[PDB]
Amino acid sequence: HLRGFANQHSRVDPEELFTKLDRIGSFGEVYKGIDNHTKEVVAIKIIDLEEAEDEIEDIQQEITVLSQCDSPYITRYFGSYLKSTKLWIIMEYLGGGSALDLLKPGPLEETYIATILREILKGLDYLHSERKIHRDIKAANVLLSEQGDVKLADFGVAGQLTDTQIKRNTFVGTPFWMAPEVIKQSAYDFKADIWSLGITAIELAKGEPPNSDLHPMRVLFLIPKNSPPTLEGQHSKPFKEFVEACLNKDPRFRPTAKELLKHKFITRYTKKTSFLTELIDRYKRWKSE
Numbered sequence: 567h568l569r570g571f572a573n574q575h576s577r578v579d580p581e582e583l584f585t586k587l588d589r590i591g592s593f594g595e596v597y598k599g600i601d602n603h604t605k606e607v608v609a610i611k612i613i614d615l616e617e618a619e620d621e622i623e624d625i626q627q628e629i630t631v632l633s634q635c636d637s638p639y640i641t642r643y644f645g646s647y648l649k650s651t652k653l654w655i656i657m658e659y660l661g662g663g664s665a666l667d668l669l670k671p672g673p674l675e676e677t678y679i680a681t682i683l684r685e686i687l688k689g690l691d692y693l694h695s696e697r698k699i700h701r702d703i704k705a706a707n708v709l710l711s712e713q714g715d716v717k718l719a720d721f722g723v724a725g726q727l728t729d730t731q732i733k734r735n736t737f738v739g740t741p742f743w744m745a746p747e748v749i750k751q752s753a754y755d756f757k758a759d760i761w762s763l764g765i766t767a768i769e770l771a772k773g774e775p776p777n778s779d780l781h782p783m784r785v786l787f788l789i790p791k792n793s794p795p796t797l798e799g800q801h802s803k804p805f806k807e808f809v810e811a812c813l814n815k816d817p818r819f820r821p822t823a824k825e826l827l828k829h830k831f832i833t834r835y836t837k838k839t840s841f842l843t844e845l846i847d848r849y850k851r852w853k854s855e
């Protein structure tokens with residue numbers, strides 16, 4: 567019956583307040599838009615509540631989580647508008663695209679990789695201090711501004727720990743990146759995101775996560791039973807070590823995000839976030855050629 571759902575949103579016509587511009591591409595379509603009064607560029611996600619009917623609980627969880635976050639490393643939520651069955655969510659616009667998009671032209675140098683990982687770790691450190699678990703860390707959900715600032719995105723399956731619930735047990739995530747304890751529905755916590763981060767670190771170096779040669783349902787079955795993936799090939803030892811630390815089957819051995827920010831791979835290859843604009847420049851040249 568969605569009692570209390572409409573109460574949380576503004577019931578004014580969003581078409582009167584925003585100008586829906588270019589389409590970009592969970593739950594619905596994203597557009598680069600503009601606030602008609604302040605002239606600020608925003609991202610507008612439009613969800614069809616009839617099409618996404620079975621995911622209403624997840625749509626609500628996303629807005630609740632986004633509203634409770636206040637950090638430069640987490641995509642900002644400006645507000646939401648309800649127009650019949652269409653819900654418009656006004657979000658921070660990140661014009662640099664995703665880390666997955668920036669991988670399309672070719673391989674990423676370790677300086678870029680470690681800088682992106684350091685920014686993801688700040689986001690995770692913030693979420694984990696707020697008792698939140700992202701639960702869907704992957705390069706697709708790592709977004710960049712046009713100045714190179716890195717922000718975590720997509721909180722539809724995010725989890726919240728409280729005193730009644732010290733651990734989560736929900737089977738959520740994208741199979742290749744999912745933690746063995748999440749797949750098994752064991753009581754898990756923040757360490758699930760540290761494993762996803764390790765998969766994402768391999769993804770940033772290879773353009774695809776480990777085990778991309780396997781069917782996703784086979785990877786779900788095998789992840790908890792087999793040895794964890796490793797970073798194979800022409801990569802530095804501190805990078806391979808960073809991946810090994812993240813990818814321990816026993817979550818007790820995975821370091822916290824705070825501990826990972828001091829890792830040799832991070833302190834040795836990181837540079838200013840502003841240097842990530844070189845990846846946006848490379849993408850522009852790549853698409854123009």
Ligand SMILES: CC(C)(C)c1cc(NC(=O)c2ccc(S(=O)(=O)N3CCCC3)cc2)n[nH]1
Binds near residue numbers: 658662667720849850
């Ligand atoms: C709603 C949320 C998720 C907060 C959002 C998304 C979001 N931005 C984008 O989704 C986005 C923006 C641009 C492109 S691009 O194709 O122009 N590009 C150029 C460099 C690499 C590719 C691709 C994606 N901002 N906010």
